[PDB]
Every structure is written in C-alpha cells, then in structure tokens.
Amino acid sequence: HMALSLANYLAADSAAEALRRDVRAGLTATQKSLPPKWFYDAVGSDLFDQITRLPEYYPTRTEAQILRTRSAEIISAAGADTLVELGSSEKTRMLLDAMRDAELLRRFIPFDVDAGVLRSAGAAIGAEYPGIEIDAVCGDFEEHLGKIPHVGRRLVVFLGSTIGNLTPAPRAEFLSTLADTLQPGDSLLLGTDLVKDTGRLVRAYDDAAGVTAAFNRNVLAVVNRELSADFDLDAFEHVAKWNSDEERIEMWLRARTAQHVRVAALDLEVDFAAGEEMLTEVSCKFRPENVVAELAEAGLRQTHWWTDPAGDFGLSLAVR
Numbered sequence: 001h002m003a004l005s006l007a008n009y010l011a012a013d014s015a016a017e018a019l020r021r022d023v024r025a026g027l028t029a030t031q032k033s034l035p036p037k038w039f040y041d042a043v044g045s046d047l048f049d050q051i052t053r054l055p056e057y058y059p060t061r062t063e064a065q066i067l068r069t070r071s072a073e074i075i076s077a078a079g080a081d082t083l084v085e086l087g088s089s090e091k092t093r094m095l096l097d098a099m100r101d102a103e104l105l106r107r108f109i110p111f112d113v114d115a116g117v118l119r120s121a122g123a124a125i126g127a128e129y130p131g132i133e134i135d136a137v138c139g140d141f142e143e144h145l146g147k148i149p150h151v152g153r154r155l156v157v158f159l160g161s162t163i164g165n166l167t168p169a170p171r172a173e174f175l176s177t178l179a180d181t182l183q184p185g186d187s188l189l190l191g192t193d194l195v196k197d198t199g200r201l202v203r204a205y206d207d208a209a210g211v212t213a214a215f216n217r218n219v220l221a222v223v224n225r226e227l228s229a230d231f232d233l234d235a236f237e238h239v240a241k242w243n244s245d246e247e248r249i250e251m252w253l254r255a256r257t258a259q260h261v262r263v264a265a266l267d268l269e270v271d272f273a274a275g276e277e278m279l280t281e282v283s284c285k286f287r288p289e290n291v292v293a294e295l296a297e298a299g300l301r302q303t304h305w306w307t308d309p310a311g312d313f314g315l316s317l318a319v320r
C-alpha cells in the first residue's frame with residue numbers, strides 16, 4: 001500500500017537548466033550530439049521497456065536468465081539484508097525472492113529519476129514483500145549516490161549494462177564514486193554486456209520493428225517540447241553503428257535532407273546538412289578481463305563472475 005520513505009533531489013528547474021546547457025553545447029558542436037539521459041521522459045521510458053522485449057535485444061533476457069539460475073548463489077555471496085537498485089524488475093524480483101528465501105530481506109532502496117515510478121514500486125514491492133522497509137531516492141546516479149542511505153548490509157545493483165552508456169572517463173568517475181560509498185559488508189552487483197558477434201550487436205540496436213528508431217527519434221520530441229524546437233522527426237533516420245576501435249555501439253540520427261532547426265528557448269538556430277549525423281548514445285561493450293580492471297581501478301575487487309554459456313553477458317560481484 002502506501003508505506004514509503006521517499007527523498008527527492010531532482011528539481012524541475014535544475015532539469016530545465018541542464019537540458020538547455022546540454023542541447024546548446026550538443027547542437028552547436030561541429031560534430032553534433034545529444035546526451036542519452038534525455039531519452040527517458042515518460043514516452044521514452046515506455047519505449048525502452050518495449051525494447052527489453054524485442055527479439056533482437058538480447059541483453060535484458062540474457063541477464064535475467066543468469067539471475068534466474070544463480071540468484072541463490074549471488075545472494076549467499078553478498079550476505080546482504082538490503083537491496084539497493086540503481087535504475088528502478090523481473091530481474092529485481094529474482095534477487096528479492098532469493099533474499100527472502102534466505103530469510104535476510106529487511107530493506108529495499110530503489111534509486112530512479114521518476115518519483116512516480118518509485119512510488120508505484122513502493123506499493124507493488126511493499127505488497128509483494130510484507131514488512132519490507134522501502135526507502136526510495138529520486139536522483140540521477142551521476143550526482144546523488146552519496147544520498148543513498150547506509151543502513152544495513154547493502155547489495156547495490158546496477159544492471160542492464162547501463163554502465164556501458166557512459167564513455168570511459170565519466171564511467172570510471174561513476175564507479176569510483178559508487179565504490180567510495182560502500183562500507184565493509186556491502187557489495188556491488190554490476191551488469192556488463194560483452195563483446196560478441198558484431199551483426200548481433202547492431203541488430204539489437206536496429207530492430208526490424210523500428211522500436212529502437214522511435215526511441216532514438218523521441219529525443220527530438222523531448223527537445224521540441226521542452227525547449228520549443230521544430231525538429232521534423234520524420235526527416236531523421238535511425239542509424240546504429242559498431243565502433244570497432246572503441247568497441248561500442250553508437251546510435252546516430254541522420255538528416256536525410258538539409259534541415260534548419262530553431263530552438264526558440266535558446267534563441268538558437270541550427271542547420272543539418274543532408275546526410276549529416278548526430279550522436280545520441282553510446283553503448284560500450286566489455287571484455288571480461290577489462291571488467292576486472294575497471295572495477296580494480298575504482299577500488300573494487302571482483303569476487304564473483306557469472307556469465308551465460310554463450311558469453312553474451314556478464315554479472316560481477318565486487319567489494320571494497
């Protein structure tokens with residue numbers, strides 16, 4: 001039902017400030033870009049949820065299968081009574097069920113950008129696990145990790161390879177910051193999508209049904225609405241690329257003809273040449289050996305490594 005603690009560090013004026021800043025900088029760069037965090041308004045979050053069920057998008061179900069078959073082992077290794085989830089599901093329940101089965105579950109700490117979603121989880125989870133304490137935190141995981149409570153022995157999970165949506169420099173910064181908040185008896189469960197057949201990688205971000213394309217183009221709808229811009233969404237083509245040098249998927253939006261875009265709120269006018277491409281997201285893919293090193297660099301020791309038989313996806317347990 002309604003039992004909940006919820007702390008909110010996301011102000012609408014701060015969000016507006018950041019978007020203006022991001023869009024001005026991104027659209028005036030010789031190589032245009034937009035940060036992917038702006039994908040996730042209500043519509044875009046819905047579209048991502050649909051992406052997780054696409055035939056081509058293996059990551060969610062691959063990760064879920066690993067959690068499904070190793071839930072007990074993960075929870076036994078963590079020895080936690082508190083689950084901290086950065087980014088909010090079926091995956092969630094597997095972990096919580098295992099903690100409950102082990103008679104360890106005391107507390108659930110969801111960390112997400114949408115307070116509404118957090119409130120819904122508080123009710124659902126509160127109902128599913130009677131007596132559980134729920135302390136929700138509305139924040140962005142790049143700035144408010146220090147606001148996460150430290151009560152209990154905490155299993156901090158960052159699933160879905162969302163860590164791959166940060167380029168190396170901010171990624172290392174995030175991991176270090178996160179590691180610094182862990183006490184003895186705390187653990188990090190990190191999901192990393194792994195280097196694999198490049199055809200499979202591109203198809204996962206360029207599905208036949210055009211759902212990912214809609215997800216990508218929606219960032220233009222967000223800008224149109226929030227900054228009073230006039231992007232013609234239909235004029236932009238969805239492009240997914242494998243960058244072999246950086247070993248990352250990239251999502252681009254390509255102007256199929258010359259476009260003139262006015263962003264009224266920024267007193268800004270911007271031009272796209274025919275065939276000009278704008279970078280909207282990276283999805284970095286990892287090699288198993290490099291996951292160990294990136295954790296070590298952040299001050300975390302990898303104590304467990306779970307991966308599906310095909311080696312498509314990896315889950316790390318790590319501690320200070």
Ligand SMILES: CN(C)[C@@H](Cc1c[nH]cn1)C(=O)O
Nearest residue numbers: 051160161162165205212283
């Ligand atoms: C959120 N992150 C894990 C997703 C974002 C995504 C999914 N499809 C397109 N972009 C990924 O990089 O796979």
